[PDB]
Design an enzyme around this catalytic site. Structure first.
Site, short mmCIF file in Angstrom:
data_model
loop_
_atom_site.label_atom_id
_atom_site.label_comp_id
_atom_site.label_asym_id
_atom_site.label_seq_id
_atom_site.Cartn_x
_atom_site.Cartn_y
_atom_site.Cartn_z
CD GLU A 1 -6.80 9.79 -7.92
OE1 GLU A 1 -5.74 9.77 -8.57
OE2 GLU A 1 -6.84 9.94 -6.69
CG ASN B 1 3.15 7.52 -7.84
OD1 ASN B 1 2.63 6.40 -7.89
ND2 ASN B 1 2.46 8.63 -8.06
CB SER C 1 4.78 2.96 -7.26
OG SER C 1 4.39 4.23 -6.78
CG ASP D 1 -0.54 6.46 -9.03
OD1 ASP D 1 -0.33 5.56 -8.19
OD2 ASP D 1 -0.23 7.65 -8.84
CG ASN E 1 0.94 3.13 -6.00
OD1 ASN E 1 1.56 2.31 -5.33
ND2 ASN E 1 1.52 4.14 -6.59
CG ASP F 1 -6.01 -2.69 2.91
OD1 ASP F 1 -6.18 -3.83 3.41
OD2 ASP F 1 -4.88 -2.19 2.74
C1 LIG Z 1 -5.66 4.14 -5.15
C2 LIG Z 1 -4.29 3.77 -4.66
O1 LIG Z 1 -3.61 2.91 -5.21
N1 LIG Z 1 -3.87 4.45 -3.60
C3 LIG Z 1 -2.55 4.26 -3.01
C4 LIG Z 1 -2.67 3.92 -1.53
O2 LIG Z 1 -3.31 2.66 -1.37
C5 LIG Z 1 -1.30 3.97 -0.84
O3 LIG Z 1 -1.54 4.11 0.57
C6 LIG Z 1 -1.11 3.03 1.35
O4 LIG Z 1 -2.00 1.94 1.16
C7 LIG Z 1 -1.72 0.80 1.98
C8 LIG Z 1 -2.68 -0.30 1.56
O5 LIG Z 1 -4.04 0.02 1.85
C9 LIG Z 1 -1.86 1.22 3.44
O6 LIG Z 1 -1.63 0.06 4.25
C10 LIG Z 1 -2.72 -0.30 5.04
O7 LIG Z 1 -2.84 0.63 6.11
C11 LIG Z 1 -4.03 0.44 6.88
C12 LIG Z 1 -4.14 1.63 7.81
O8 LIG Z 1 -2.97 1.74 8.62
C13 LIG Z 1 -3.90 -0.90 7.60
O9 LIG Z 1 -5.10 -1.17 8.32
C14 LIG Z 1 -3.66 -2.02 6.59
O10 LIG Z 1 -3.36 -3.26 7.23
C15 LIG Z 1 -2.55 -1.71 5.58
N2 LIG Z 1 -2.57 -2.69 4.50
C16 LIG Z 1 -1.50 -3.39 4.14
C17 LIG Z 1 -1.73 -4.39 3.05
O11 LIG Z 1 -0.41 -3.23 4.66
C18 LIG Z 1 -0.90 2.35 3.77
O12 LIG Z 1 -1.12 2.84 5.09
C19 LIG Z 1 -1.06 3.52 2.79
N3 LIG Z 1 0.01 4.50 2.95
C20 LIG Z 1 -0.23 5.78 3.19
C21 LIG Z 1 -1.67 6.18 3.31
O13 LIG Z 1 0.68 6.60 3.30
C22 LIG Z 1 -0.47 5.19 -1.22
C23 LIG Z 1 0.96 5.19 -0.73
O14 LIG Z 1 1.74 4.14 -1.31
O15 LIG Z 1 -0.43 5.28 -2.65
C24 LIG Z 1 -1.70 5.52 -3.20
O16 LIG Z 1 -1.55 5.85 -4.55
#
Ligand SMILES: CC(=O)N[C@@H]1[C@@H](O)[C@H](O[C@@H]2O[C@H](CO)[C@@H](O[C@@H]3O[C@H](CO)[C@@H](O)[C@H](O)[C@H]3NC(C)=O)[C@H](O)[C@H]2NC(C)=O)[C@@H](CO)O[C@H]1O
Ligand SMILES: [Cl-]
Ligand SMILES: [Cl-]
Ligand code: NA
EC number: 3.2.1.17
Length: 129
Positions: free
Chosen positions: A35, A46, A50, A52, A59, A101
């Site tokens: 990373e 990104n 956003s 990182d 992020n 999460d």
């Molecule tokens: C290291 C880092 O910052 N990584 C970033 C990722 O966190 C991000 O992915 C998205 O993250 C959110 C928060 O965890 C995901 O939402 C969660 O989704 C799960 C599974 O569906 C659900 O149980 C949770 O309730 C929900 N949390 C919230 C607070 O809503 C979301 O699905 C991810 N999106 C994806 C995987 O596409 C990504 C994309 O912004 O960025 C990374 O850099």
């Protein structure tokens, strides 16, 4: 700060990441390597606007506030600049919430594509832990 490999391993272990949510220490060191190259000051923009931040490339759309990611959240309740410190405390505390999460370490793209399913124990070879 650019950590040494075993230096970062020791720091993450002390802060409680070794086997946190079941992820062995080598997973976390491997993730940091690809990373940020172990560089606490790493930042990357990104396509969605956003950014990182830090050793684990956390992020700003979800986890920290940088004042320039509209419609984002700040789920770690921290300024993104705190994630660039030579002290990895803020990054580790936030990483614990991310990995809890729902999607585990798949939240780290580099982990999924370069560490997952590999012999991550090799990342802590030779370290006094
Ligand atoms: C290291 C880092 O910052 N990584 C970033 C990722 O966190 C991000 O992915 C998205 O993250 C959110 C928060 O965890 C995901 O939402 C969660 O989704 C799960 C599974 O569906 C659900 O149980 C949770 O309730 C929900 N949390 C919230 C607070 O809503 C979301 O699905 C991810 N999106 C994806 C995987 O596409 C990504 C994309 O912004 O960025 C990374 O850099
Ligand atoms: Cl390991
Ligand atoms: Cl998991
Ligand atoms: Na944000």
């Amino acid at each position: 700060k650019v950590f040494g490999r075993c230096e970062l391993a020791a720091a993450m272990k002390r802060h409680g990441l070794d086997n946190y949510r079941g992820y062995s220490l080598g997973n976390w060191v491997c993730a940091a390597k690809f990373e940020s190259n172990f560089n606490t000051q790493a930042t990357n923009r990104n396509t969605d606007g956003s950014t990182d931040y830090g050793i684990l490339q956390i992020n700003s759309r979800w986890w920290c506030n940088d004042g320039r990611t509209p419609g984002s959240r700040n789920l770690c309740n921290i300024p993104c600049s705190a994630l660039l410190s030579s002290d990895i405390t803020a990054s580790v505390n936030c990483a614990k919430k991310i990995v809890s999460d729902g999607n585990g370490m798949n939240a780290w793209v580099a982990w999924r594509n370069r560490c997952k399913g590999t012999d991550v124990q090799a990342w802590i070879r030779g370290c006094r832990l």
